[model samples]
Target: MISLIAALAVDRVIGMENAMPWNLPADLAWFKRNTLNKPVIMGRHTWESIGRPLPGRKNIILSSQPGTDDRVTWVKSVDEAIAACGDVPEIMVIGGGRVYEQFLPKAQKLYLTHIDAEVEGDTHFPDYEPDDWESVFSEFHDADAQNSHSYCFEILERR
Candidate 1:
């Protein structure tokens, strides 16, 4: 299974200046819970923003540049990332806009957190129609001390 995960604003702004525009600890927790123990592929900027390899899962860096960061595997293309997953039952596509664009077509599922407000951002989630997916799960979280905006967690799947 190939699944994508992201938290985006109402306008679909995903990143600003290479980092997420909002602070939602709940979203981070949700991300870790779902992505744990699954191999995740992401673009170089996402890796840079994160600054370290995710623990427990094989981190696949999808970039043209090769390096000695033995903590993660470097792949030059989407096909290589898929090949790197090998016999793994699922691969998670964690993002920045560019990487999402490359992998979205192949993803069978998506875990999305929809924030209530729109914000300025240089990067945005790739265009997708809700009508194309079957809603699998959803939960709403109201903004609290730990979260700035009310959000909805949604899981969607394709046939």
Candidate 2:
């Protein structure tokens, strides 16, 4: 099944200048643990920003113009990326707005991290109405503990 993983803010902001604004170590760890060994799909800019493929996971980067590179399966379309997942049970579509929008319709699950506060961000989450998804699990965290940022982790599935 296709899945989406991302962190968003109160104003639905996802990134500021192409990077996350919060310092939620727990959230990051949660992402790492869940997505490990899975196929992760993302946009070209997201891959470029990170500089290389993440260890322990297969990285698939989508670009309008493309060519294959070491450790990065460069695909020119979403169907190609999905095909790469093959018999794998789940593939995580990691973001950059355009990628999210493109894959949203095909995703069956969403691993969303909602930060409590709003901050400056040029990118926003793909717009969707509440009727589109159902929250299956949720956990909230405060600024005090291991997580330096206040946030909520929600596992949602498309209706």
Candidate 3:
């Protein structure tokens, strides 16, 4: 199954200067917990922004620039990325706007952390509306020492 996962502001902001616009360890922990054992697909810019393969999960970077390394797997398209992923229940499409957009049409599920505040960002999450999805799970967390804003973790599936 294809899934889109993201931590975005209510205004849809996800990145600034190729990095996260805000810090929320609670959300990060939530993200890591869900994605830990799955294969994740991301764009090259997102890969560059992160600087290394994420541990404990297979990192599949979709880039046409072409370089192979043992640290992560590289593929040229979404089809190739899917083929590269092992037998996981679902493949996570983690992003930088464009990557999210491209994977969107095929996504059967979404894991979103919606932060309550708007933040400035160069990149934003792709548009997704509640009308198109039904909530599978939801949880809310207040801002804490390690988090800057109250956020909601929502798992949605196409209706």
Task: Kindly report which residue stretches of model 2 are placed more than 4 angstroms away from their true locations once superposed.
Answer: none
Best TM-score among the predictions, by candidate number: 1
The whole-model lDDT of each prediction reads: 0.91, 0.87, 0.89
Q: Pick the candidate with the highest lDDT.
A: 1
Q: Across residues 1-159, which tens digit of lDDT does each residue of candidate 2 receive?
A: 999999898788988887776788888898899899999999987887778789999998898885557667888788899998788999999998989998888889999999887698898889977798999999987888666668899999999
RMSD of each: 1.0, 1.4, 1.3
Please, what's the RMSD in Å of model 1?
1.0
lDDT of 1: 0.91
Candidate ranking under TM-score, highest first, comes to 1, 3, 2
**Model 3 Cα shift for residue 102 (angstroms):** 0.7
Ranking by lDDT: 1, 3, 2
Lowest summed lDDT across 10 adjacent residues in model 2 is found at 66-75
Model 1 scores worst on lDDT over the 10 consecutive residues at 62-71
What are the clash counts of all predictions, listed in order?
0, 0, 0
